[PDB]
Design a protein around this ligand. Structure first.
Ligand SMILES: CCCCCCCC/C=C\CCCCCCCC(=O)O[C@@H](COC(=O)CCCCCCCCCCCCCCC)COP(=O)([O-])OCC[N+](C)(C)C
Ligand SMILES: CCCCCCCCCCCCCCCC
Lengths: 394, 394, 394, 394, 394
């Protein structure tokens, strides 16, 4: 009854097109804040951030006032979209197909005219994602809010500190903070400020998933490629091991494909590490082929060069600490024995080529193990957030 | 005719903005329940629960009353959205792009004014999914409902036990229960309660799919890696078997990729088991290479150390229960025979290295079989719901 | 002119909220049918059926009547959504995000008041899909239609036989039939029936795609694993063949992954067949390793046991129908010859171990071929619809 | 001013429910055409065609007429949806979730009452796709348009030739043509025609993508399988080559999976060709195993049968154009020499088995090369559109 | 108060159907521009461009004028969709399911009647994408804007230079420019121009992603195939290396599949390069098989032809710079020695076939290395934008 009288009275001559100020020259203050509930997606390719956010707007409507003694029990009235005036505050850098992601709830007003509008939404904002340091990257995503048509002398947009009391932690990203900043804009025509409120969402990528599902499968496969150097050449499986390890890494590259970004703004750190892994495993297969040329060298081919003999068999091998009728019977038997002697001389030349190949294996083992470690620790710890990341995620 | 008169009479001076109470100071009770028909999706990455739910709301409209003797045959009237007042009860933790998932059906009212509103919907709710114990994980998803703008002195939200009589069992999740709880909230300004009704949907992941399409393909591939230790070194296929088993497991890791979650909140149990499998198969290839170094050891290399001879050939091998012209003719023939004697001495040294490699194979077989079983049974039975899970799903 | 007069006359005092009966106590009959044009999707995971369906509703509006002599040429009038009354018949088990999939076309009415409403739609219905017998499964999907708010004394819902004259045959599913059944419901409060009309869409999965893209690639790969038993042990490729066949089957398991359902309600028939295939191929690699232990057995190891010699070399091999100076010269020459004699004795022991391995190969060939055939024909023909399926699809 | 007067005058007593004819018994002619801009998708699984189309409708409104001398400068008026009458022409075989894909633009009317309505849309139509001859298939997709509620005595639907002047050529499909045909329908009740206008979009699949990304990768892999027959048996890599080629083809089958349709209406031509490829490569591995049994046949096994010796070594090999103290010393030396003689006899028997295997290799080479070519050229040129397709696409 | 009076005054007799000109014969000028914020997607298959764009429209409304001295403080009024007249400027080549992607914001008007409409949107436009030169391709996408129903004497559409001040650089595409051009159209009926404004978005594909994730993995795998020629034939792993490299390339072809376009309008440059890679690796396996036939040639087969001996062993090998009782004892011993002599003659014939195979390896190495380099540099540098692309992206 009092409620029914009040609602009928409040809408009389009310124009939702009117900015509700007692003085049309003076400004209308709007307090803008938001409440971040979730970070939903950080899409690299589309360059979009998806968040669950409750916007908070407060302002005063000069016309929606009543004395509560004259309307006992009626302390607040609600109005649905299109019935009272509302600030046209929109997310400027919206990437949503609708552009306005808000669900238009009721606007709460008390007897003094204080309006409270709490539109929820699943916002999509345009954000430049820098994947240079991926997986250890850190993003700074701006959420720029302002009025679509009212300058600062009409809609004076003020800012209130963002709320994160109901924030759900994500499993992919840390929330560092969501500071806001009210900034004015100026047109050369005029002196009027044009305010906006930008909340910069700062978020750190969690790296436990990437450590356990990429580095460990990648380091382990990268270590098996070095295992070729410990495998004898007589196993007949040195190429089998190395080329199948490369094949495994080709198969693993498909998993890496899905998660990897797809940009040309930089080479991601993760792409450097996996790219390097490929080269080291590819070169291991190369030196394996060179080793087998030594191991299977023809005994009746080119004599071991002096420099080959000097470098491998002496210096490197020291550094590595390796190291009537009866007369014709005499003729035939001697032929058999001297043939065994030639066979043994060729076997000894072959043994020297085989030891040269063992020495090249030990050198390739050391060289590749060192290169592997220095490329792993160097690429990974290059990231400015590496130590922090491992400290918080492991 | 009576119906037409009643509908015209009921809308006269009716304001859908008005909370329909005879006394504007007294509260309006709303009975809130839901009916769960389906659990549609439990998305780990988005942290969203998708459910088919029929909401149930009941309340009394003071204005929608008539005497049925004066309107014979007209016992109930229906009203579409926006014509009568409705409670603004919304899912607070909604993750839907629309935020309101309900389909606004008609509100049923009888002659006494009892309103019944049964909005169906496909709701999307924000839920923290804990995949620590995946596949044996259990989720507890809150569905928090309340009025967007009416405190407890205005909209007194009461709760009724949720219905599951029309629940369709899922193929991925058990339904443990859906208990509800009415909880009040307080603001330091005021003494008024702010009620909400939270239905906590508790659901257990069924594990038959994961047993049959992951463990069995994973255990079987994990067992073939142990088969390398029974394969002779003379087959020339020991690396072929082990490295192709690893390759198969790299290929299987791609299938595992799709289903696995993608978080850094914890290491899922399934990730521990598959990660361990990789290490055990990788190490099997490592010890295989060590075995081949023994099998293919040069007869003219370093003599079998004392400790090598003691450890392998004696202790471990016992534990395993393994164990003129004519004178020149004499010269040449003796050379041939003494050459055969040296060849046999080198063959015997080689046989002792080969038996050392057979002993290392039997030891690696036992060690890896034990490690495999203890990591399988230990990781799997670590899950607090393991015994239950297997009891209900197998 | 007559049309314009009629439309103005019909809407005078017309309330689209009013159920259009001359007597408000008597019921309003609604004839409900549908026309199935397409089966669009049978989604296992979501438990949803997608269909193209034209609903058919007929009823009488007491108010939309005119004499055609007074309105010459005007025999029918059409009305768009929200202008005249409409039955609130909805699909109860809808799984659509909108819940109402219908496109609200015009309602056709003739001079006698007979209304005809033909809403088309792409309906999504909740359906339990039973994939126990997949690919030979048969689904029975209910489409339950009724009025959201009118009991049987108000809206008397009658059923008419469903039309399939414009049905487009699917490439994935046969249409067995779409019988309907009008069923009443009762509440313990009251005696009034609450009717619904359920059309049960019965559909058989076509199996030609699954025969040609799974069984044949699976049987062929399953046959190559048995080919290992015909491969000699001297090829040096027995493990290569078997383990690469398993690798191929691991690669094929990824294709199988996409199409396979993902439930824990049962083990699908297809999952049993492929799971069995894995075991048989895995065990083939196991017995291959055992065969190579016989083939490569050390001549100076443990003597062939009696039972090994009895079982393999006699019984199984029969069942398979297999089967001064001069004196020192004498000393040296005799050493050479007796060494050749020992070498030949060891070669003969080795030949007996090698024949034992050939016998185990022939036995493993027979055993695995029989197991393979019995598991293929047994799993496949277990399906209650197997013979029919092959008869209609091949 | 004249425009403002005209718009106010035209809407006076205008009913958008009224079919706008001067005589309510006479029909209203509607000229229907469309303009095809793009073919967007031909989805096999969903059985849907997606097209960008501008519909064209023309008709006369008896009421929207004015004299332009009385309204100088005002020659045309536009009206938005729901303000004037519009034909309810819809795509009958629509597969869109909205069913009406049109964007409701303004209707253009001149002073004589000629209305022009040009609704654009992205239409989804139900089309049976026949993939029997895929990749050389040709589709004929009907777009059936008619009025939802007006028979031919009310809405006389006439047809105008479709426009393709603004058609964007597709990269996947040729446009053969889009002929239309006006067809009447009759109900046994009545004599009134029920017209529809069906535009049959005829489109040929372009095959360059499928030639270059499937046939060439498939023929090349199919040729490498035949390369096994030229590889010597002493390489020790014959199974390695063949089984890895099959593995590669298993890996290639995954790419084939994505693009292949998924129906059981027929076996696609592409499925026959790839299915045949599998069999030929599988059988190549089979005959390779048979070849190795000949190559590695035991010298002390079963003597080469007469028919084996006759068939292979003579006929096929011709067709292929292949082809005191001293006495004991005598005893020991003779033993050594006669042992070498037996070894050479066994080597010669082995050489004859090895040549038999070379002959089986040359025969298997010829047989498989011929089978391969005849299955490639036969399957491919079976397609009725093969020669045309290659002529237009290559 | 002044604002409320003004809004009430402006809507009095205002018709949003009226083009707002003082003279109905004279035209209404509309200044059209846009502001490009983002390039979101360049979809090859759908032939669609997705962009984030703020449209800019300016025009004069004759009716929305007031004197600001009479309305102090009220300098601008805003109006929502459907309240004032708006130009019906649409994107003609729209590929959006809604066709109108704009979010209808308020129209800003000042006291002089100057209207400003700034609709944002995520536009989808139909664009022919030419992937002939992919990854070095350059696209020219037209965005054709015009009025749906107003010719040039009614709506005179003028163009203003497009803004890119708020353009976010993409990670996949450079923005070369967005020039616009106002073009008139003529109908043979009439002399009136029909203007449109086309902004041609020109954009260059960035190629760093494609260099690092395709060329390098492709060149490296293409180089390992050439490594077969350096591998000795005695390793027993030449086919293993080559066929596994091909297998790896088959696995890599799956990654290539996802990113590759799917058209038959041309063969993309990337498809030529990868297709060529396959042939070169396939042929390497072919020549490897030929090499092994030489290496494993039977010593007792066909004598090395003259031309074979001349070509390989002389010319090519020079170009490559390679190069009583006692009498019976005599009989037996001579048999042993002459047998060793025959064995050595066969070993020497075999050595000559083996050196012929080494020569064919060195020739195949040179031939394939040259072919590889010329096909890589030739295909890649064929692209007209190659040098630029590498200069800007590397
Ligand atoms: C696990 C580590 C594998 C090596 C074990 C040690 C071994 O095999 O020793 C052997 C090799 O001795 C070496 O030279 C070992 C070199 C260590 C490996 C270097 C790391 C990279 C290889 C991958 C690392 C694993 C990556 C994956 C790990 C998950 C012992 O032999 P030795 O003493 O050299 O004797 C030489 C001959 N002599 C007796 C005549 C002198
Ligand atoms: C992906 C990891 C596996 C998760 C499922 C565990 C299942 C364990 C099954 C143990 C064996 C049960 C046999 C009962 C008798 C039929």
């Amino acid at each position: 009854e009092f409620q029914r009288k009040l609602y009928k009275e409040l809408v009389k001559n009310y124009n939702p097109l009117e900015r509700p100020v007692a003085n049309d020259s003076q400004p209308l203050t709007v307090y803008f804040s938001l409440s971040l509930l979730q970070i939903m997606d950080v899409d690299e390719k589309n360059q979009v951030l998806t968040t669950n956010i409750w916007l908070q707007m407060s302002w005063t409507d000069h016309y929606l006032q009543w004395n509560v003694s004259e309307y006992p029990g009626v302390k607040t009235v609600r109005f649905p979209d299109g019935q009272i005036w509302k600030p046209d505050i929109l997310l400027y850098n919206s990437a949503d197909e609708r552009f306005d992601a808000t669900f238009h709830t009721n606007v709460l007003v008390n007897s003094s005219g204080h309006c409270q509008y709490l539109p929820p939404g699943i916002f999509k904002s345009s954000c430049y994602i820098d994947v240079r340091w991926f997986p250890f990257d850190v993003q700074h995503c701006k959420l720029k809010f302002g009025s679509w048509s009212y300058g600062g002398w009409s809609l004076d947009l003020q800012m209130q500190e963002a709320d994160i009391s109901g924030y759900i932690p994500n499993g992919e990203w840390d929330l560092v903070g969501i500071p806001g900043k009210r900034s004015e804009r100026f047109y050369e025509c005029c002196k009027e400020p044009y305010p906006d409120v930008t909340f910069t969402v700062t978020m750190r990528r969690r790296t436990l998933y990437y450590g356990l599902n990429l580095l460990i499968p990648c380091v382990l496969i990268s270590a098996l490629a070095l295992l070729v150097f410990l495998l004898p050449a007589d196993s007949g499986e040195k190429i089998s091991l190395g080329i199948t390890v490369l094949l495994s890494l080709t198969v693993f590259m498909l998993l890496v494909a899905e998660i990897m970004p797809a940009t040309s703004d930089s080479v991601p750190l993760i792409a450097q590490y996996f790219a390097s892994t490929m080269i080291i495993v590819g070169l291991s297969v190369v030196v394996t082929v060179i080793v087998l040329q030594y191991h299977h060298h023809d005994p009746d081919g080119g004599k071991m060069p002096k420099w080959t003999r000097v470098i491998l068999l002496n210096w490197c091998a020291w550094f590595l600490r390796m190291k009537p009728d009866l007369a014709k019977i005499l003729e035939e038997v001697r032929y058999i024995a001297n043939r065994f002697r030639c066979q043994d001389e060729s076997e000894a030349v072959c043994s020297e080529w085989k030891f040269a190949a063992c020495v090249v294996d030990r050198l390739c083992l050391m060289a590749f193990s060192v290169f592997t470690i220095i490329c792993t620790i160097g690429i990974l710890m290059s990231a400015p957030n590496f130590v922090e990341a491992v400290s918080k995620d492991f």
